[PDB]
């Protein structure tokens, strides 16, 4: 076997180059205003004072904090990350192969793993013995061969996230699964039905009649003094959102520790 | 391979009803 | 008996051809924009300011969605792919003729086998010890002749997936059933459905009355301040849902773990 | 006695050819277009933008989705196909008359049952030992003469499914009960509704009054800004349904394993 | 196994078919005529009408409407019959029972 050092091909195989969690973005996800505009197929939104369509730039930032809703209210990392993690001595999960959990999840691969002692590396693990779930967010060593508890002995860096899927209709786990996209995407369609529910008619109308000289035009509209223009579309997105959340929180497992 | 990503109802009187 | 090495005819028959997974599509399983377009006959979605169809595009990229949703609602994998895993040493279940679940199911064939120590085979267990069932994902050893745990000391390599059904009506184990086809394709037309549900009348209107030199006409619309113009449809959509969900989750089985 | 070999006449009676498997359809349990339209006397599903009538493709599509659904709400095999399964030892179904429950039933016939090890025949049973009961989809053996399981020790071969049956109102226990028809008709009958329901008015209309030169047209369709244009026939298709579940989940048995 | 069409009026033997059966099967078999009946009494999907031309007038309101369908009551009554019916048979024959 020949590899790049810490990427061992049984233990950590690599999945990503570093130099490429900075050319990624979120549009290789297919975030993107197109995409959103293509759910709201067949609507426009502008200013009613000038005709001007909105801008991308609003649509842009919208997407990117929908893509942190997500990221909380699942416990995940979505965009590729380099962390970097001081970690506690437990007795009983010291004892367990060496056990840590990392705080973020996915693992793409682990960079580093030392025992230290301020700051001084007191071993540096072999990378052929370190084992990784990508997933599950799980590292263990393997070795080939006065208290329970002792603060930041561990030093753990690792690169957390997702991949862009490889094939349709497919993801390996380090691969974002397809309606996860969806989900962020209805986040972000649930922001621009709210901006969009304010310009279907004149400010505050619910009714209009206007008739000159036995002409007679008539509206009921979608408002109302309870709900909103854009509220139906709204609660038909919610439905969909918790089918997905349902989804991927059955995906992701349930948080777990012991004490 | 790669993912995909970005009439007939007529009116008419009863006429036996009109008779009647 | 002769046989391709690891398909053993009893223990492990070959299913699928790994050329074959390459070349395997969406349309091969009947997902495809007019399978959609069937279930609304007689409807067609346009853009009411240019009278422009729909593109297929958006049709494909809603069906590869939802076959991420059925994969995700149904603890499955639908289309054929193949799947690397390393899992860990339980003595229970390793005593238990080597039993093993693999994370993802059907199994269409078992690709190797191996117990490893850094990478390095230990022992390659023969092809014709392999027992295989398919739609379970259970794999076991039945030899022809200091802790509980250790991780990823089995190595395992197999293909999942589902295969188009040969015949009307019937599928094997390992064939697509015909209601999961009908779940994908209710999946993408609820979406196409909310789509279509605001095009239909313009936008944001619940009534109209227009009166011009003696021509008088009054439309009612399913639009209304609660509910979108496609609510029935989407009901309807959701019950049809709610029953294949519960069909096939008597398909498969409850997931169960001993701790 | 004489009888061609696997079909001992008391304990293994043939009930269908082998070559007839391939030649039954689905018209000839009566499952045909035509039957749906008896059903939807009366009406007409055409396309409005061109008056040509729905294709008999999309009714046999229908029609093979809703078996699926039927062979999925029951537990039960409709149409004959030919199982061909590797079931587990275990002690105490082994000890009593080598018990085996068919994964799929009824039996129709069993074509084969051998105990084998890594695919060699260990012994072949006498078909004169045979035992099946068909609806049950039992089979036992009555001889004329290091662990509590293990894995795929016995192979079975035998043809599941439900042959025409012979008189009307009457079924033997390999025969479709006449009412599991009626059942995958009212499946299908509850897609065509819900296709026709959109062709009843133009897209969308809850109501609509016309007049010119006080000549005056109004309508008030069964749409609704709630229920679509099948509602009520839908939610009577559904009682139906209830009742023929019920009554056919009194002729086929809870299911039940013991541990 | 089966029965025999009954003998005398207003009478059955235990082999012989009790006349309130046949009234079951009726009842079962006119559901479902009246639920196809219930699509052709008036134009399809239709629940109001109102036409006027030239100094004739005619309104007409339908039983069929946005939730029930023309025949919703007379299936509503049969469903009613068909209970009363079943609750005797299902006296008349006993509660299935098995020793285990």
């Known amino acids: 076997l020949n590899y790049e050092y810490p990427y061992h091909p049984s233990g950590n195989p690599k999945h990503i180059d570093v130099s490429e969690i900075d050319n990624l973005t979120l549009a290789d996800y297919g975030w993107s205003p197109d995409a959103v505009k293509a759910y709201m197929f067949g609507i426009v939104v502008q200013n009613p004072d000038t005709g001007q369509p909105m801008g991308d730039e609003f649509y842009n930032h919208i997407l990117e904090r929908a893509v942190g809703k997500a990221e909380r209210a699942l416990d995940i990392s979505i965009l590729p990350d380099t962390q970097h993690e001081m970690r506690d001595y437990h007795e009983t999960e010291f004892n367990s192969y060496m056990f840590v959990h990392a705080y973020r999840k996915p693992i793409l691969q682990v960079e580093n793993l030392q025992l230290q002692f301020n700051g001084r590396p007191i071993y540096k693990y072999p990378a052929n013995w370190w084992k990784v779930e990508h997933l599950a967010g799980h590292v263990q060593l393997f070795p080939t061969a006065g208290a329970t508890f002792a603060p930041q002995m561990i030093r753990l860096e690792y690169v957390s996230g997702m991949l862009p899927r490889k094939k349709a209709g497919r993801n390996k786990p380090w691969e974002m699964p397809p309606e996860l996209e969806q989900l962020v995407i209805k986040y972000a369609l649930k922001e621009i039905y709210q901006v969009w529910g304010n310009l279907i008619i004149g400010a505050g109308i619910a009714n209009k009649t206007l008739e000159v000289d036995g002409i007679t035009e008539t509206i009921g509209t979608t408002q109302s003094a309870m709900y909103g223009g854009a509220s139906a579309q709204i609660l038909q997105i919610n439905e969909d959102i918790k089918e997905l959340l349902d989804g991927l929180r059955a995906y992701f497992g349930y948080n777990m520790i012991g004490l | ?20």
């Open chain 2, 1 to 20: 391979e790669k993912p995909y990503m970005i009439y007939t109802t007529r009116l008419e009187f009863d006429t036996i009803d009109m008779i009647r």
